[PDB]
Each structure stands twice: as structure tokens, then as C-alpha cells.
Amino acid sequence: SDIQMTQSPSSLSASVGDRVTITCRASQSVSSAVAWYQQKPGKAPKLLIYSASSLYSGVPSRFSGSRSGTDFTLTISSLQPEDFATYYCQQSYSFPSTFGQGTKVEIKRTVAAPSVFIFPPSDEQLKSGTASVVCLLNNFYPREAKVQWKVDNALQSGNSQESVTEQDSADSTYSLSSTLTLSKADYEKHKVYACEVTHQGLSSPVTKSFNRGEC
């Protein structure tokens, strides 16, 4: 039966300087044939630890691995902002090789309110037939944020989509984009388009807006 590497926790948040512990539990003996990897958004995994407790060359010594029977632990002695990543254990004791489900490590930091910018649709988009209004929430913490679209003071529903960046490797912040999609014929039936943002860094919600045809 294929060997399973049960990894926990599925995610954690830790403030900078915290000691972080990640645990992997093999379903049967894997001797010491365990590797740990760090994977950053968009990038291939990088090797941190081999043979369960040996530090790969080039890897900062704040990373360390340990073994107790079938329990394997990765430790970060003092979490740094650049340590935001997903971490994976792997067994290389028998085929097929097996990875744990991964652990996404998030940085906890001080509250930061977003900067809020709105972008009216381009002339070039309009004559193709549709209209996108973009609301940009920049460099905020935490990730939770409310984006409300009002068109001539009427709330929108199912008319927008949101995308959120991965945590920033240097300042541990997030950015978000909400884009209101509207047909050209519909876009020209109304004048005011408003992005309304609620966030814990904001003492009261922030509205940015523009009037159609006057951008």
C-alpha cells in the first residue's frame, strides 16, 4: 500500500519572529528518507531539508528538521517575512513517492488600510462592445475586505469579480482588484459608478467614484 505523509496544520498564521513547527506523519516506516520543500507563489519547490534532518546547502540555518520514528517536523526558528510559502514534506523511501498535502504559512502583521483607486473603462474597450470598471485596493492587511459597487446609488449583484494577490514577500500585505463588467449599452444608461470599500484599517468605509463620459 502506498505510504501516506499526513501533514499538519493545513495552514498557519504566525507573526514575524515566531518559531513555526510543521509536522508530517508517515503511515509506515520511511527510515529517514524524508525531504522538506518550500514553494513560493508561481515558483518551483525549493529543497530545504534532506534525510529528515540535514540542511540543504545554501538554505538559511533558521530551518531545521527532526525525526522521531514516523513523525517528522520542520521548524523555522524565527519566521521572516520572506518565509511566506507553502511547505511540503516528501517520502523517498519506496515507490511511489508521496508528498504531504502542504502547509501554507501566512505572516501576521500590523493592520494596514488599503489605498483605493478606480479606473473607468477605456475608449478602446467600449467600441469593442463591453465595459469593465476596475477598483484597486492596494497594499492592505488583513486580507478580508468588502468591495461594494453602486451604479447611480444602486447596489450591484453578480456584476463583478475579485482577485487577490498572494501575501507580499517584503511587507506582508495584500492587494485586490474588483472589476465590474457591463455591456456598452447598459454602461451608457447610468452616470455615476462607485467602488465602496470596507476594511478594518478604515475608520469608516472609503468610496471612490467617477461620472461616465467625464474621465
Added chain:
Amino acid sequence: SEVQLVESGGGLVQPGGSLRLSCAASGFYISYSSIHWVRQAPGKGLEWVASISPYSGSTYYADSVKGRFTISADTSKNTAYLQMNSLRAEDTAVYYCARQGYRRRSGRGFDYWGQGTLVTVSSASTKGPSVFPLAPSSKSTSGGTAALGCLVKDYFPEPVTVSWNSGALTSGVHTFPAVLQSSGLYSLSSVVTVPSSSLGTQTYICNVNHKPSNTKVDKKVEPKSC
């Protein structure tokens, strides 16, 4: 760095079709190492696919791909391969090749990895994106910094690259994860923040690459006056 693994062969493929991925090595000779393939379905974890051992050519396969996939190693080209037949929707993933390092130096750890290549198994057809500007204004200005961007809309499949000023401009850049629209097409936007005083002098150009449709677009993003 010194050792590199350079992959190719990815792209859109019909369900039930086939693709061969290549893994070109540099800085070392694949004959002395084990070579592995590991995949990552979008949003998901690493999944080991196959390996090939040195000196014996022994090959090993995950059960999810056994009998459909074939790993091989052309030492005379210093290149490894993965032949993928009868591909299913569940084979969509980023595919990595990885070198298992030398026993005495890194155990059985995978010490070097390819930059990955995406295989989308889909009966849908490829469509290039439309790039629209997101102009800076007083409505994107705050405290001497201004935001401008590019809206990359209505494309398939993933991925698109976006750089700015041919990669001369990197800080302050945010390229957002793509979002899958109800039409079944993707769109994303890339924004950048710049000193507002530079909006008159400096030209900002976003460069959008969508290899599945041969598209390569440079679009200048100039200020509007709100």
C-alpha cells in the same frame, strides 16, 4: 545558477490526446542522477508522477498515470522526457521535472527543479487576449504615487505573462491571479504604482504574452485627465 532544468512541450491538448514534455539539462549529465516528474493541479498540492533511475533505466509511475505515461532519458541529448497519452481533464496541472541530488550531498532530496510547464486538457479552443489600458488620473493618485495598469481580457487557456517596460520596471507591480469568466474565458489585470511626477515624462508600456495563441502585445498606458 549552475545546474538548470529547462522544460518545454506544454500547452492545450484535447481530452484523449497526447503530449511529450521535454526536460533539458545543463551544468550536469542526467546519466548519473535519478530524474523525476512532479505535477501540481492548479490550486492544489504536489503530486509525484514518475522517475527514472541511473545505470539501470528502471522506471516508476504513480498509479494515477501508470500505463498512460512513459518517462525516458536521452543521455546523448542530455534531455529527459514524459510522454503523456490518453490525457484526462484531471491531468491538467503544472508539470515539473526535478533532479534527485547526489546521495552523499543531498540524500534523496530533489535539489534542482524545472521552472514548470502547464498542460491544459480541454476540448475548448484557444483564444488570444484583448489588452486595454488602465490610465492614471487624479482618481488613481494619492500622496505623490499614482496607479496605472493593463486589463488582459477574454483569453484561453492560461497562462499569460505580463511585464512592464520590457521588464525594466518591477517594483510596485501587482499582476493579479486570473479569474475564470462565465463565458469560460480568463481575464486578469496588472497594476503598477509610480511617482505621480513621472506621469508626464516616463512612458509606461505593459507587455502581454499569451503563447497558446501566439499573442505578444505591447500597449502604452498614458494618463487621462479626470
Added chain:
RNA sequence: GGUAAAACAGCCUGUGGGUGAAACACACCCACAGGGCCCAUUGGGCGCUAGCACUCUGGUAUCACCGUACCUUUGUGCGCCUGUUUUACC
């Protein structure tokens, strides 16, 4: 690698541990279990032999006895073959 000089090992079959750019396969090293053949059999020997030296156990011919020569067997040293390792010089 070449040269020179050494060391260690070598009946068969599996098994385990290790090393070789090495998870298996392969090569080599090192152990263990079981087995085979020879002997003078509570034990000892076996890389190979049409040879050599000596010795030893049984024979065969001389042959009154004694003594001699050949065969065989126990070993020892050679001769012959393989594997690995080491040193010096080039």
C-alpha cells in the same frame, strides 16, 4: 594508466550490510545461513593441474629379512589462474 613491489581473498547457493555519480538492476567489498566434493572423518581440506620439491597415509613391484623404485593419500612450498586493495616512481 604504465612499471615495480606487496597485502587480502577465491568450492557452490542464497541472504544481509556497505561502497561504486548508484533506492531497483549491475559491479565490487564484507558478513551470515545452508549445501557439495576430498580426507587418514568427534576433525581437516576444496581458485586450477598431465608438472616440481619435500613430507605423510595406504598400496604395487622388486624381495628371506632389510633395503630401493613407482603409485596413492595428508599436508607444506612452488608452478598456474582470478578478484579487490595498498605503496613507490613515471
